[PDB]
Design a protein around this ligand. Structure first.
Ligand SMILES: *[C@@H]1O[C@H](CO)[C@@H](O[C@@H]2O[C@H](CO)[C@@H](O[C@@H]3O[C@H](CO)[C@@H](O)[C@H](O[C@H]4O[C@H](CO)[C@@H](O)[C@H](O)[C@@H]4O)[C@@H]3O)[C@H](O)[C@H]2NC(C)=O)[C@H](O)[C@H]1NC(C)=O
Ligand SMILES: *[C@@H]1O[C@H](CO)[C@@H](O[C@@H]2O[C@H](CO)[C@@H](O)[C@H](O)[C@H]2NC(C)=O)[C@H](O)[C@H]1NC(C)=O
Ligand SMILES: *[C@@H]1O[C@H](CO)[C@@H](O[C@@H]2O[C@H](CO)[C@@H](O)[C@H](O)[C@H]2NC(C)=O)[C@H](O)[C@H]1NC(C)=O
Ligand SMILES: *[C@@H]1O[C@H](CO)[C@@H](O[C@@H]2O[C@H](CO)[C@@H](O)[C@H](O)[C@H]2NC(C)=O)[C@H](O)[C@H]1NC(C)=O
Ligand SMILES: *[C@@H]1O[C@H](CO[C@@H]2O[C@@H](C)[C@@H](O)[C@@H](O)[C@@H]2O)[C@@H](O)[C@H](O)[C@H]1NC(C)=O
Ligand SMILES: *[C@@H]1O[C@H](CO[C@@H]2O[C@@H](C)[C@@H](O)[C@@H](O)[C@@H]2O)[C@@H](O)[C@H](O)[C@H]1NC(C)=O
Ligand SMILES: *[C@@H]1O[C@H](CO[C@@H]2O[C@@H](C)[C@@H](O)[C@@H](O)[C@@H]2O)[C@@H](O)[C@H](O)[C@H]1NC(C)=O
Ligand SMILES: *[C@@H]1O[C@H](CO[C@@H]2O[C@@H](C)[C@@H](O)[C@@H](O)[C@@H]2O)[C@@H](O)[C@H](O)[C@H]1NC(C)=O
Ligand SMILES: *[C@@H]1O[C@H](CO[C@@H]2O[C@@H](C)[C@@H](O)[C@@H](O)[C@@H]2O)[C@@H](O)[C@H](O)[C@H]1NC(C)=O
Ligand SMILES: *[C@@H]1O[C@H](CO[C@@H]2O[C@@H](C)[C@@H](O)[C@@H](O)[C@@H]2O)[C@@H](O)[C@H](O)[C@H]1NC(C)=O
Ligand SMILES: *[C@@H]1O[C@H](CO)[C@@H](O)[C@H](O)[C@H]1NC(C)=O
Ligand SMILES: *[C@@H]1O[C@H](CO)[C@@H](O)[C@H](O)[C@H]1NC(C)=O
Ligand SMILES: *[C@@H]1O[C@H](CO)[C@@H](O)[C@H](O)[C@H]1NC(C)=O
Ligand SMILES: *[C@@H]1O[C@H](CO)[C@@H](O)[C@H](O)[C@H]1NC(C)=O
Ligand SMILES: *[C@@H]1O[C@H](CO)[C@@H](O)[C@H](O)[C@H]1NC(C)=O
Ligand SMILES: *[C@@H]1O[C@H](CO)[C@@H](O)[C@H](O)[C@H]1NC(C)=O
Ligand SMILES: *[C@@H]1O[C@H](CO)[C@@H](O)[C@H](O)[C@H]1NC(C)=O
Ligand SMILES: *[C@@H]1O[C@H](CO)[C@@H](O)[C@H](O)[C@H]1NC(C)=O
Ligand SMILES: *[C@@H]1O[C@H](CO)[C@@H](O)[C@H](O)[C@H]1NC(C)=O
Ligand SMILES: *[C@@H]1O[C@H](CO)[C@@H](O)[C@H](O)[C@H]1NC(C)=O
Ligand SMILES: *[C@@H]1O[C@H](CO)[C@@H](O)[C@H](O)[C@H]1NC(C)=O
Ligand SMILES: *[C@@H]1O[C@H](CO)[C@@H](O)[C@H](O)[C@H]1NC(C)=O
Ligand SMILES: *[C@@H]1O[C@H](CO)[C@@H](O)[C@H](O)[C@H]1NC(C)=O
Ligand SMILES: *[C@@H]1O[C@H](CO)[C@@H](O)[C@H](O)[C@H]1NC(C)=O
Ligand SMILES: *[C@@H]1O[C@H](CO)[C@@H](O)[C@H](O)[C@H]1NC(C)=O
Ligand SMILES: *[C@@H]1O[C@H](CO)[C@@H](O)[C@H](O)[C@H]1NC(C)=O
Ligand SMILES: *[C@@H]1O[C@H](CO)[C@@H](O)[C@H](O)[C@H]1NC(C)=O
Ligand SMILES: *[C@@H]1O[C@H](CO)[C@@H](O)[C@H](O)[C@H]1NC(C)=O
Ligand SMILES: *[C@@H]1O[C@H](CO)[C@@H](O)[C@H](O)[C@H]1NC(C)=O
Ligand SMILES: *[C@@H]1O[C@H](CO)[C@@H](O)[C@H](O)[C@H]1NC(C)=O
Ligand SMILES: *[C@@H]1O[C@H](CO)[C@@H](O)[C@H](O)[C@H]1NC(C)=O
Lengths: 419, 124, 120, 120, 120
């Protein structure tokens, strides 16, 4: 009747995990393929997380380790015209630093942000740096930028990356329009918390994605279909000086500020932001009731790293207060100014044993970026607050459309052909 | 409705040549194997030749094996037979027929489903 | 006409693109990339070894002397080759591939011994 | 009589040493050596896969059903096998090897389908 | 019935388990493990290449046109296939395997040339 016939080169695949490789400085449509996608169970996210951290750590290996600076500092108030918003933000700290010769010392004074230092014994002249009790700070190399250069992830032979082209796709379930790609689009590893910057926009509508939308323990990733432009600045002219603390080892610090001292801040158009939230609210009401109340509120608690919008602006690390963006209730040429704090001693990843010193940048800093999505958490009346402390969510927002499968070319079927 | 229409020749001298052709319509031409079946004026049916749906495989009755060529054009829905050396014994009606073979991934045939009306070939 | 382009097509159509997929099976930081490459080679060789064991070495379409059990699938040829894509077919008989593979090996083992004794 | 000893000899002489060359295709500090070894294996397997695709698996000399186009080379057999060494020949037709390889694949694909339908 | 289970059995019994062993040939800290895996692949490929050179590609039992020299072993078939296990046999003719391998290669080289001239 019918006989087993063996075929090799069959267009069949199964879900699989593997190691993807980099490509830095092609697409086949698959006409009648419907595939099941599931962001949040996508291991491409876990790989990107580990690769970004590893590359970050590698870049600090050849940089000056600031152990000579774990000394007592004598700090007084800065003798300049400091506005009310900046009182107590800066301190003028003196210390005895090592030099290139072991039997010599030098007296150095520098400006530090208050967030980077701590009083000892509750004494108002003697302070230490924040990490002297937990870690050695490593200074980032001034020649190495923090720019989020795009990375493409490519599959090894025997594997393929499938891509979902459905414009209304929410990260899970069947995708009726699937193509095969050799390598992903370039993804910029932008590191930020509650507002996602410089990512991809939704093609048509604001898309709200959540692993379980009714579960208040889960985060909600909101992709915008329009960017909101945000303008950030540190409006102070910084004079950057350096000293040798060892054999070819230079430490960089702010010596002084030229002119008045003002608070760093970000500007979001008021009208654009109100249109953006109206769109988010309309989509939230498709998961929540229609005749409901949607309230936005500020982050409820935790340290500065999670209660603010954290980002790298021109090499400086900003911590902006977004209570001016998330303070409204929606029931059935102005701008919003967001105050920002600056830190030089940071921990980047949610880790304890590492710390980095970001050397100051000479001059005045300005950067412009696009808000392309929000990370929200949820508490009638539903209340939503900013979230985003875990960087894996930033990467889920770009990788949600990709899946990795293994090719299984061998198979059998009945035919009328016999050996 | 499936139609097979022979548009071949007529009278030819012994030792000459004559080409038959058959135009097909009403079905996917390329899905079926085809054959030529011959009927002498006073006789029954005789199988002469068979061709594959893709045109790659041909089979013949021994009596015409070194003389006839069976061919196919799947773009023009045309079946053809080129006959050479035409013996007096080749006088017959030649019918265009669909069937006689399948492609392994298909249910089998081994019978003829459709017939044309036949060209009369006379060798004098 | 590219790699996996036929994935949504019928088995009888997709079977004509076997060389398209066959050619895409082959091609401390950097170690995990070597592991991926070594593993891809090992996977490839196991499938090739298996075809050799079954007597299908060197070919993409191989007919055998193993009959089909309709307990494996009772669909006819029009259901299988003119519908059920290869992805659909693979799901339907996944439970039976080890039984079929064992029967392909057993058959080849009898064939090689019957052929050595006819050359004697 | 050793590896590449026939490189300067005529194609018809060099063709008798094919096993001499075939056997010399197979065999942080130390990683670049693994990369070289993995790469050598991958190269080897791609050439073997290609012979299989063309229906030449397991042999050093393989005849095909692909006719020669004299647009590729219009030299006769005495010019090619009794002069032009293989290095010279390779230069002369380098521009045509992808056309020829494509035609070898297309032919094998028709041959395997015509043979499965004759076993039916 | 598992891997090497037949090692203590007679050659004529052990010859029926060839697929059992064939399938067990394939599958800074961690580098020596990659070296072991790369090496296992290279070993495998050399044995497969050698079978191809002798004209035995794709099969576990291969008959050749090389006669046996009784200078290699003068035992009869009952002594060899109904006694001397494969471990015992391997010891007895170890001194002759390179002579035999050379003669298998020479024979295949004559066979491929005689077959190309008959297709001409
Ligand atoms: C979101 O995307 C926008 C658009 O890409 C991005 O804005 C860009 O930021 C970079 C980095 O701050 C700007 O590039 C600098 O421009 C100044 C002014 O000309 C130059 O002086 C800088 O060169 C010095 O510093 C470099 C190290 O960063 C050294 O390598 C160099 O030798 C010099 O010493 C540098 O070129 C760029 O101009 C803007 N683009 C625009 C249109 O404004 C924004 O930062 C992204 N946001 C986030 C959070 O990633
Ligand atoms: C953010 O908006 C404020 C207004 O609220 C801008 O402040 C003005 O800046 C101009 C100089 O360009 C001064 O002449 C005005 O006197 C300032 N107004 C006030 C009320 O202070 C600020 O420049 C904007 N932002 C950014 C990020 O550069
Ligand atoms: C930090 O304090 C130092 C003094 O400890 C300030 O430097 C002095 O400035 C006066 C002028 O006001 C000069 O006459 C002294 O010679 C300077 N002393 C030294 C050691 O340079 C310094 O300006 C203060 N820093 C800031 C940013 O205000
Ligand atoms: C952002 O600014 C708001 C004020 O606009 C801060 O909110 C206040 O927090 C204190 C607790 O420390 C409450 O007692 C006040 O009632 C809050 N004010 C208002 C108007 O609600 C908020 O803490 C700041 N966030 C960060 C991270 O600095
Ligand atoms: C066909 O299979 C029949 C039932 O076999 C059983 O069911 C199948 C689905 C498998 O699970 C198998 O392991 C079970 O044994 C047999 O009774 C029948 O004899 C088989 N036909 C053959 C081999 O001739
Ligand atoms: C091939 O099968 C066709 C469909 O058969 C029917 O539907 C399938 C899914 C089963 O449930 C089967 O038992 C049903 O009878 C038939 O229409 C077609 O005629 C069959 N072809 C041949 C040549 O037998
Ligand atoms: C032989 O080639 C003729 C010319 O083909 C063209 O020139 C060669 C050198 C290649 O560059 C090719 O890609 C060009 O198309 C054809 O016209 C002729 O039909 C070919 N013979 C065959 C295939 O029968
Ligand atoms: C084979 O070719 C020989 C050389 O032919 C001539 O030189 C070559 C390079 C071309 O330019 C060609 O057009 C010239 O005619 C002939 O001497 C020899 O007779 C040929 N052999 C046969 C059997 O035809
Ligand atoms: C069989 O072998 C005879 C002796 O060959 C020699 O002894 C064997 C054991 C090997 O060491 C070999 O290298 C020596 O040459 C030959 O005299 C005899 O001709 C061979 N039979 C053949 C090849 O027909
Ligand atoms: C096969 O050989 C058997 C054993 O032969 C004897 O012992 C071996 C070890 C040698 O020393 C040999 O010279 C001796 O003659 C025979 O008993 C048996 O009959 C032989 N079988 C056949 C068919 O000839
Ligand atoms: C600082 O503020 C005082 C009071 O308004 C003013 O007299 C003084 O000139 C300002 N300093 C500078 C450098 O302008
Ligand atoms: C220094 O600044 C702090 C604000 O952080 C203020 O409370 C204190 O009184 C100031 N001391 C002097 C001497 O100006
Ligand atoms: C620096 O050294 C001097 C002695 O030369 C000492 O009086 C002063 O308190 C030291 N500075 C600090 C911050 O300990
Ligand atoms: C360092 O001191 C701070 C108080 O200034 C304390 O909160 C922190 O836990 C200490 N770190 C360690 C490792 O003990
Ligand atoms: C995402 O889409 C799936 C499939 O339609 C649906 O079951 C799920 O509830 C949706 N989740 C969200 C947050 O929209
Ligand atoms: C989603 O969350 C609800 C609680 O809001 C829970 O009852 C339900 O079981 C969860 N569903 C899944 C698939 O985890
Ligand atoms: C900042 O200081 C530099 C001198 O180092 C001067 O050339 C520049 O114009 C100043 N910029 C501003 C905004 O004050
Ligand atoms: C941001 O700066 C651009 C010019 O670079 C300006 O057109 C835009 O209005 C500014 N946005 C806000 C919110 O101030
Ligand atoms: C935001 O939208 C609401 C609802 O339409 C409206 O009442 C409110 O005035 C708007 N606010 C701004 C700043 O446009
Ligand atoms: C919710 O309101 C919108 C109009 O804003 C309407 O189109 C939609 O059908 C309503 N959905 C339900 C469940 O009532
Ligand atoms: C929210 O807006 C009201 C004015 O409508 C203002 O009084 C209140 O302080 C704002 N809350 C925050 C946290 O800024
Ligand atoms: C914001 O989006 C627009 C539209 O895609 C683009 O032209 C612009 O360059 C983006 N801005 C930034 C800072 O990337
Ligand atoms: C997809 O299905 C349509 C019929 O609805 C068919 O014409 C087309 O060829 C199929 N696509 C593929 C890749 O087979
Ligand atoms: C699908 O299956 C049926 C038999 O079940 C068959 O008649 C048909 O040819 C197949 N394909 C199409 C074209 O629907
Ligand atoms: C395959 O096996 C599963 C259990 O693993 C069983 O539920 C199913 O009915 C079997 N039949 C198929 C899909 O062939
Ligand atoms: C080199 O050419 C000479 C003729 O000049 C020939 O006798 C010799 O065999 C050739 N060498 C090789 C390796 O073929
Ligand atoms: C070289 O080519 C010519 C034909 O062109 C041929 O007669 C001769 O045999 C070839 N080899 C020699 C020995 O020169
Ligand atoms: C081969 O191609 C080159 C251009 O790449 C051309 O100049 C040459 O004439 C071609 N002919 C040969 C050597 O066969
Ligand atoms: C071991 O030898 C005995 C005879 O003494 C035999 O029956 C048994 O089958 C042999 N074992 C194997 C694995 O062949
Ligand atoms: C062992 O060898 C002898 C011949 O030497 C043979 O008669 C016998 O069959 C072989 N095996 C057994 C069963 O002893
Ligand atoms: C095999 O070679 C050794 C020397 O290496 C020799 O002593 C022995 O007699 C030879 N004969 C055998 C065991 O076949």
């Amino acid at each position: 009747n019918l006989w087993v016939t063996v075929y090799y080169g069959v267009p069949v695949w199964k879900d699989a995990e593997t190691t993807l490789f980099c490509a830095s400085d092609q697409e086949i449509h698959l006409e009648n393929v419907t595939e099941e996608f599931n962001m949040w169970k996508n291991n491409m996210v876990e790989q990107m997380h580990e690769d970004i951290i590893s590359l970050w750590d590698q870049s600090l290996k050849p940089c000056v380790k600031l152990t000579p600076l774990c000394v007592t500092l004598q700090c007084t108030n800065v003798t300049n015209n400091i506005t009310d918003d900046m009182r107590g933000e800066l301190k003028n700290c003196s210390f005895n630093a090592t030099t290139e010769l072991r039997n010599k010392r030098q007296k150095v004074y520098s400006l530090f942000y208050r967030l980077d230092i701590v009083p000892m014994g509750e004494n108002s002249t003697n302070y230490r740096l924040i990490n002297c009790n937990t870690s050695a700070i490593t200074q980032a190399c001034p020649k190495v930028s923090f720019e989020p250069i795009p990375i493409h992830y490519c599959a090894p032979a025997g594997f393929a990356i499938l891509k979902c082209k459905d414009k209304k796709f929410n990260g899970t379930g069947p995708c009726p329009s699937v193509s095969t790609v050799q390598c992903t689009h370039g993804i910029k590893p932008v590191v930020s918390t509650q507002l996602l910057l410089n990512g991809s926009l939704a093609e048509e509508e604001v898309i709200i994605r959540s692993e379980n939308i009714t579960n208040n323990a889960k985060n909600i990733l909101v992709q915008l279909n329009t960017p909101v432009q945000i303008n950030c600045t540190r409006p102070n002219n910084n004079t950057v000086k350096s000293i040798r603390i060892g054999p070819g080892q230079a430490f960089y610090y702010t010596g002084d500020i030229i002119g008045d001292i003002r608070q760093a801040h970000c500007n979001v158009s008021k009208a654009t932001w109100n249109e953006t939230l109206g769109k988010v609210v309309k989509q939230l009401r498709k998961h929540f009731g229609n005749n409901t109340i949607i309230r936005f509120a500020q982050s409820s608690g935790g340290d500065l790293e999670v209660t603010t919008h954290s980002f790298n602006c021109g090499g400086e690390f900003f911590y902006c207060n977004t209570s001016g963006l998330f303070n409204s209730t929606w029931i059935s040429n102005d701008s919003i100014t967001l105050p920002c704090r600056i830190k030089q001693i940071i921990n980047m990843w949610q880790r304890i044993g590492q710390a980095m010193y970001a050397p100051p940048i000479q001059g005045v800093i300005r950067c412009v970026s696009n808000i392309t999505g929000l990370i929200l958490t949820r508490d009638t009346t539903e209340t939503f607050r900013p979230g985003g402390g875990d960087m894996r969510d930033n990467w889920r927002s770009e990788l949600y459309k990709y899946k990795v499968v293994k090719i299984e070319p061998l198979g059998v079927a009945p035919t009328r052909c016999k050996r | 409705e499936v139609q097979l229409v022979e548009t071949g020749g007529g009278l030819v001298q012994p030792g000459g040549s004559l080409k038959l052709s058959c135009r097909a319509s009403g079905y996917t031409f390329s899905s079926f194997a085809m054959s030529w079946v011959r009927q002498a004026p006073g006789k029954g049916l005789e199988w002469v030749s068979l061709i594959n749906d893709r045109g790659g495989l041909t089979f013949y009755v021994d009596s015409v094996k070194g003389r006839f060529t069976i061919s196919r054009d799947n773009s023009k829905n045309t079946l053809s037979l080129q006959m050479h050396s035409l013996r007096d014994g080749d006088t017959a009606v030649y019918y265009c027929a669909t069937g006689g073979m399948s492609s392994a991934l298909q249910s089998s045939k081994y019978y003829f489903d459709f017939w044309g009306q036949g060209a009369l070939v006379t060798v004098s | 006409l590219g790699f996996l382009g036929a994935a949504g097509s019928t088995m009888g159509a997709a079977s004509m693109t076997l060389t398209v997929q066959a050619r895409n099976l082959l091609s401390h930081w950097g170690i995990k990339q070597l592991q991926a490459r070594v593993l891809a080679v090992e996977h490839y060789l196991r499938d090739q070894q298996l075809l050799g064991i079954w007597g299908c070495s060197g070919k993409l379409i191989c007919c055998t002397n193993v009959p089909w059990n309709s307990s494996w699938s009772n669909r006819n040829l029009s259901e299988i080759w003119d519908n059920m894509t290869w992805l659909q077919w693979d799901k339907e008989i996944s439970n039976y591939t080890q039984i079929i593979y064992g029967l392909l090996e057993e058959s080849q083992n009898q064939q090689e011994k019957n052929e050595q004794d006819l050359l004697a």
